Write a protein that binds this ligand. Structure first.
Ligand SMILES: Nc1ncnc2c1ncn2[C@@H]1O[C@H](COP(=O)(O)OP(=O)(O)NP(=O)(O)O)[C@@H](O)[C@H]1O
Ligand SMILES: Nc1ncnc2c1ncn2[C@@H]1O[C@H](COP(=O)(O)OP(=O)(O)NP(=O)(O)O)[C@@H](O)[C@H]1O
Ligand SMILES: Nc1ncnc2c1ncn2[C@@H]1O[C@H](COP(=O)(O)OP(=O)(O)NP(=O)(O)O)[C@@H](O)[C@H]1O
Ligand SMILES: Nc1ncnc2c1ncn2[C@@H]1O[C@H](COP(=O)(O)OP(=O)(O)NP(=O)(O)O)[C@@H](O)[C@H]1O
Ligand SMILES: Nc1ncnc2c1ncn2[C@@H]1O[C@H](COP(=O)(O)OP(=O)(O)NP(=O)(O)O)[C@@H](O)[C@H]1O
Ligand SMILES: [Mg+2]
Ligand SMILES: [Mg+2]
Ligand SMILES: [Mg+2]
Ligand SMILES: [Mg+2]
Ligand SMILES: [Mg+2]
Ligand SMILES: [Mg+2]
Ligand SMILES: [Mg+2]
Lengths: 260, 260, 260, 260, 260, 260, 260
DNA sequence: ATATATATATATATATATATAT
DNA sequence: ATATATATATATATATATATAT
């Protein structure tokens, strides 16, 4: 049972992907853009479910490689490091395509990146956290989208919009957008119960996320999916660590106070 | 028919060159400058039809090569990468002339570029996106225009003007200019219908630039050719994907909202 | 006896760790977060007992190394220098893990830090004085917590909260918190006597921290564990230097006036 | 006649040297400096007639070579490329003297340059666009002037003055100067008519550059010669291309608007 | 004749300089100050003929440049922009002397301004609208007058006097003054007729500005030269637009009512 | 004689140093302070004779340099520019000592300034117009006076006193002071005649500055030496320009009215 | 005797250290803090005897170096320059310890400073004029005191208190303080006579600082030691320069008036 | 003969922050 | 509250001769 307890904390520790309306709308939108080689920017709030949705979109299309040829990777997802220069972006791109870099000058990296990017038949390049990369590499992402006909989707906090706003063409080129929903309302109530069954995975305790727990969670999370996830996992881990089989109102008040 | 559908999305995906007053004025202007070996700068807004017009001008004069001699390329078009140094500009120039570079020092590249640039009888050097190249290569483009009697036409967003403004001679040498029109008015109404027949190549809805669709498009595109094209292709692709044979007002409202 | 006097001033000079409710609550909280790989921020006042408590938590879990393998360091504690850049943070992290740095570029440091951070099985990364590091390294600490599943605990004065407030995701990601108590009241009275026996270590003088000395110390320290420790050590050192065997009211009034 | 038209556009395309007070003052000044082996710097505005005047001075003294000995080149004119290093300056100098370079180290180039520079009896070294060469080659031009007794005349935009100002001896050594005139006033009126007869070379049209055309040209050129020339050649080419035998007010308004 | 009508409205549109006692007194005064390198302030009312008089004084002494040396500009006239800082004043000064600015720090601008201000042998620096520049640049104008021995003449509305009054030395240094006359009386009657012949330039209509028109104009203009000019030009333009060959009493009553 | 007239206006244009009780008291005071390395501040009114007196004190002690060693400059006089930062003050100091600055950081300038300031054996540092320099450079002037034992004499309008008043130590350190006299009374009467013989230098006209001219000048100048000088030079120049051999009462009334 | 006179002015010129109750209290206080590695801030007025007292404390403990090892410098005194950055503070610290700096980055300086600061066994770091250093170096002084167990004593005018007040921990960490006495009263009377014998060193004149001279000095100095010293030295120098063997009431009235 | 590190500093902003001002 | 210098520590690519030891 302590073996089972180790299973429980490890399983609750790792995150899951519970499919809700947000990620489905995002996938539909991204399919629409990718069929049209259209570069959009999918902006949203922070702690709201953007990176997970882009990852899910990256996975449903896992590259199916020909028996002996370079794998046709339709969607490429990279999330650059802080102040990603043009060299670093190319390193990340050609790394995700699983071509190790040969040491060279920025131009050599650019040339090799274009070569493996046309070779692997990339259709969409999702740059997550695209407010990090420097203004002098938006020129190269513009170049990629400009010549290879690749739908570049810049993901990022609202800060990304101002980041593209002070530049001129990036703002013109990346103008189709899709704001992440806040999720508040009856749909938020569904999500709450959806987390109980899908992710929490506990023997049914007849909790049912009643208006009390819902008031607590609307009070605490403010609608952010992260916050829903962080709070519920913490409460579950706490309750199982103290022997409680289900989640009490006590531990819910605990995590509520220790956030706000 | 699904075969036909694949034909339709692929054809709508790729862009066309619909000839309108803007590109014709530009060609006439560039012919005037080229007959006089006059270096101008053709500035304009962003998402407005500059690169396409320069490309069209590059194509009508496709080089006619002597049977065995280097091809006389009258117009050379290059659009340098971000922070194009003097070496990189020469690489791009001598690449467009189809002479592969022999590895060497910046001086060697300069000498070879002058040699193949006088050899191919180049008359005009259109540097698109000429706000990218560094201030220390305007000296070399000045040198080219200075010694080879070649009309250098710098294309770029308005940022290019400030870019040449802080330098001194580039501003004096490149002072003849041609602003890209915004196109708004009755001429915009013509363009709208001109896109229906030329580029959309779909069964006519008999809209004839109907004032409703025109209000929508004036409302949405703000006159940018780049926005009429993006919107119309998206609406066409959407309507054909959902089975609709023509474009409904519904999908037009869709793309309108998803831009602004 | 002068030998004994040297022992006394040296022992009073060095600090001790007297276990009280604050550090116990902190350890319990940090255990809860670490079992859940949950990143919190344990904020509090200044001169209040945060660094000492984090150090005590670092020590109870001293790494138990396999006979010949890299030591599994469960908790890593670093307190960066002023304006810690991303390179400097990685240097400190990989230093605490006892891997000397090989000279390289910021990317190389990042890669090596991730490699030794997954190797040593780190579970928690306590960044003390986490208001120092620059905004452009919160991205990397976000990245660490993001990919390695490591509970990053940012410690700091209240200034840290504003420091994370102007940034966007750091504020969302680090939202569970634990304010340091001020300690005032009967519990403060206990602490006072607890310092007499544990840390002061003097032959019993029947002082007993009577309401007079308590009024003085509540008057002087304002509850900060730092002010009590500083005051009591000074008074003890003074009294032993002037030959007094216990602490008089005179020296207590002395240190009281010389603070406020 | 179309043959004649080709003659006309080709003749108008190429530039001429119309002798006016500016170049005459410059030649007199340079003769004075050269008789005294005096290094000056002839600064001026941009688009004003400096390079042409230095070239004219270079040509009136074309080297008269002894029957079989190295030609005594009294005046040497070079205009270095961007960031001319010490090696590059020597290459240009010994190239202008028509001694091909033998591949070697910077020292070897220096030694050979001194040898051919004393051999050809050079008296004056006009470095046009002398704001290009790097600060570490002003030492070598100082050396040349210091040992060979050669009047080094640095030509350049006003930026050259600041370029020598941050260095110390170059500023002391090159302190005699001659600012290029702006030419505005009655003398500008003469120049205008002087361009009609000398350079435009058209059947007399009784235009006579009347106060109207003079207001236009003062309005447009702002006195810059190289602007009077650009405008007049363009207007002439346009008028001859559209069949007009003389220059109309229409085409003058055209070029006026298309500059400012 | 419509051609003639276009000539008439264009000629009436542009202003002239009719020489009257005010500008002559000002020139005599400024000559007296300039021979003595004496800094005065020529204060006056608003809409009264100060800027025009200073301009006329600037023009009679148009700089006569040596054949090849910097032009000796005896009088320099600048009218700074709103809240002219010390950098901006130097930019305007060295611009009027036709030396383009090299980008630098405020100190660099100051040094270059002193260098070109002693070089061009400037004798008088007329700062028109000298109530605009900030209090922290009166120090620099004091410095100029202080070291170069240059007669600085501050022009401005009466607000300028209070502007110098709250500062201390500017008030002491700029104390010689010359108030602009209001012009009312018989001399105003002369001016009225002087505007008919000099500036209005119409076939003689035997109007002669009789006591009626004089009562109207004394009633309307209140003596301000600007209002006379404004009124007379408007009446002339109106009368010529409605076909009237001379100015009727009707249009004079019109402009009179539409001012007051 | 017109040659003589040019001599007269040029001689009257340039200023002289007529020695009167004010400058003698100042020199005695400054000698007393300098023998004692005492930092004072010699405050006074504006337009009163402070800068001239400090200059005269600077000149009587012209540095006597050893045959080959750095010149021992006992008194150093600088009058900083507006908002003189710490770098700028050091530039001015080490400039007056005739050591050109080597480009560096503020610290490097400080170190070099201390080195050449101890080398040239400076005894007194007269900062004229010492209300200009910023509050953050009073620290460095405090430092100079603090370490080198150099009598720093801050000169300035009364505004300087408030400028040092809001700072704390500058006010304590610079507290010995010497107010400039207003000069009104019989001593003013002497000065008046002293200007006739010393500075005006005219054939004796038996004017003798009688009670009438004295009433005029007391009425006009209010005792300021500047105004005494400004008025007398203007009247002399006017009278000599209009042919008058001496100064009439007419021109005295003229300058009187044109000041007040 | 003139030789003797040169001895007298030179001896009076240089300052002495007359030991009075203020410096003795300060030394006792600093010994108490240093035995306890306690960081205090010894605040006081300006022109009151703080720097001299800290210097005297620095000298009584002159480092006694082992025969061949780094000298154990117990007390380190530095008084940073204006806006001392973190690099500059480290330069000053490691300079006072007589280790010349090896050129490097701010981090390298920090590391070397910690290394030589633990090596020389520093016990106390007296930062005189500690209101100069920037807020971003209080972090490093906090760090020093934080890790090396070094009693950092910040000296400064009252402005230092506000300087630490707007920061947060510096105010908490440096809270023990010692205000400089104003010295007024009978103790001031003693000091007065103590300056006669100790510092003035004159043949006894039976002056005895009688109530008259005491009223003058209380009237003039206001108790500041700095002013007693300044006044007495000036009066002594004056009286010896004018031949007077003792100090008269005349010269005392002189310096009194020339201060206030 | 040749590739070879091998430093070579070396620019150029590069923002980036921080006043200080109205 | 919005704007404008201004010093400054720093990271970065880069390309240039350059000796030099097989
Ligand atoms: N569809 C989902 N299913 C399950 N968990 C999710 C889902 N979306 C988000 N989360 C949780 O939310 C957190 C990650 O959300 P994330 O997608 O990173 O938001 P984010 O906005 O992309 N982060 P950031 O963009 O940097 O502010 C994790 O705790 C996930 O468990
Ligand atoms: N004449 C044209 N015919 C058809 N499509 C055109 C035409 N001109 C522009 N476009 C469309 O506009 C987009 C390209 O316009 P483009 O010429 O690049 O503007 P641009 O200003 O040069 N881009 P940029 O300069 O970087 O802001 C594409 O979507 C084209 O389909
Ligand atoms: N004396 C002249 N006769 C005829 N054309 C002239 C003359 N001087 C200048 N030009 C024209 O002016 C242009 C060249 O002027 P130029 O001498 O290069 O000015 P510049 O200042 O040297 N150029 P730059 O120094 O780089 O700003 C050409 O168009 C010439 O035709
Ligand atoms: N001497 C003149 N001859 C002709 N028109 C004049 C003359 N003086 C002034 N004006 C007219 O008056 C107007 C300009 O007067 P102006 O000299 O600017 O007065 P001002 O006081 O300098 N303006 P301002 O100082 O800003 O109040 C124009 O309409 C001129 O036509
Ligand atoms: N001793 C003197 N002999 C002759 N002229 C003098 C003398 N003192 C002052 N002046 C005149 O007064 C003017 C300069 O006086 P100045 O010494 O600058 O006063 P100031 O107070 O220092 N100026 P400022 O401090 O900025 O208000 C000049 O016109 C001098 O000719
Ligand atoms: Mg995210
Ligand atoms: Mg484009
Ligand atoms: Mg702490
Ligand atoms: Mg030129
Ligand atoms: Mg005006
Ligand atoms: Mg003065
Ligand atoms: Mg002090």
């Amino acid at each position: 049972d302590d073996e089972w307890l180790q299973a429980e904390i490890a399983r609750l520790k790792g995150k899951s992907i519970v499919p809700l309306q947000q990620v489905k709308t995002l996938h539909d939108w991204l399919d629409g853009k990718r069929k049209a080689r259209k570069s959009c920017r999918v902006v949203g709030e922070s702690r709201t479910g953007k990176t997970v949705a882009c990852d899910a979109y990256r996975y449903r299309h896992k590259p199916q490689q020909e028996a002996g040829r370079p794998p046709t990777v339709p969607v490429v997802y990279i999330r650059p490091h802080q102040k990603c220069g043009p060299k670093d972006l190319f390193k990340k791109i050609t790394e995700y395509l699983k071509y190790r870099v040969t040491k060279g000058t920025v131009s050599d990296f650019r040339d090799r990146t274009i070569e493996v990017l046309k070779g692997c038949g990339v259709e969409m390049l999702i740059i997550d956290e695209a407010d990090r990369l420097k203004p002098e590499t938006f020129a190269d992402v513009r170049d990629i989208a400009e010549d290879l006909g690749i739908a570049v989707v810049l993901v990022g906090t609202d800060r990304l919009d101002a980041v593209i706003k002070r530049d001129e063409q990036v703002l013109e080129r990346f103008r189709a957008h899709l704001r992440f929903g806040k999720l508040s309302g009856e749909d938020f109530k569904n999500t709450v119960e959806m987390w109980e069954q899908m992710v929490l995975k506990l023997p049914v305790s007849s909790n049912l996320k009643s208006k009390e727990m819902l008031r607590i969670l609307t009070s605490a999370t403010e609608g952010y999916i992260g916050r829903l996830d962080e709070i519920l996992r913490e409460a579950a881990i706490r309750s199982l660590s103290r022997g409680l089989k289900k989640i009490d109102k006590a531990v819910l008040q605990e995590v509520a106070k220790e956030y706000k």
